[PDB]
From a paper:
Chemoreceptor proteins bind ligands (either directly or indirectly) and transmit a signal to downstream chemotaxis machinery in order to control flagellar rotation and bacterial motility.
To shed light on the molecular basis for recognition of C2 and C3 carboxylates by PscD, we determined the three-dimensional structure of PscD-SD (residues 31–188) using X-ray crystallography. The Cache domain of PscD consists of an N-terminal helix-loop-helix, followed by an antiparallel five strand β-sheet, which is surrounded by additional helices on either side. Propionate models very well into the electron density of both structures, whereas alternative ligands (e.g. acetate, glycerol) could not be reasonably modelled into the observed density. Propionate was not present in the purification or crystallisation buffers, indicating that it was scavenged from the cells and/or medium and supporting the idea that it is a physiologically relevant ligand for PscD. The carboxyl oxygen atoms of propionate form hydrogen bonds with four residues: Tyr90, His103, Tyr143 and Lys156 and the ligand is sandwiched between two tryptophan residues, Trp92 and Trp145, giving the impression of being ‘flat-packed’ with distances of 3.5 to 4.2 Å.
Author numbering: 32 to 178
The structure:
């Protein structure tokens, strides 16, 4: 039983909630591909639904693109529609740029950074799984705060 095994286990949870939530993207992208909704309407519906999802103690999902611009953020909604390339956490970690570089290399993975908790302002350590949804150029993310 390795260190690698312990970390693989804890983060599988995060991976699996993101995979679950990404089925909404899948569903709506299918409606686009079939011609039943426009892309932008499929997008907006998918975001609306993912915005309300929660698990555990108020853990949530966000979506940013590869530019990176924030597409949907349920707890920091004033980031929506903004270029988030210049955001850095207190350790100097370039949160969204790193997420983009990660998914461009591997598709998905784990990243650690500091971020406020919902309705708070103090950046707290967080470990997130991010996953590229390729047809729309969207990164879907969720993570868990160290406490």
């Amino acid at each position: 039983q390795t260190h690698e095994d312990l970390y693989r286990a804890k983060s599988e949870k995060t991976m699996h909630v993101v995979q679950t939530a990404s089925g909404i993207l899948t569903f709506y992208q299918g409606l686009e591909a079939a011609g039943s909704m426009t892309r932008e309407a499929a997008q907006q519906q998918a975001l609306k639904e993912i915005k309300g999802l929660r698990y555990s103690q108020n853990d949530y999902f966000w979506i940013n693109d590869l530019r990176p611009v924030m597409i949907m953020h349920p707890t920091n909604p004033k980031l929506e529609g903004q270029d988030i390339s210049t955001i850095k956490d207190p350790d100097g970690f370039a949160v969204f740029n790193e997420m983009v570089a990660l998914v461009k290399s591997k598709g998905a993975g784990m990243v650690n950074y500091r971020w406020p908790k919902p309705g708070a302002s103090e950046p707290v350590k967080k470990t997130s799984y991010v996953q590229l949804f390729q047809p729309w150029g969207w990164i879907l993310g969720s993570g868990v705060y160290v406490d």
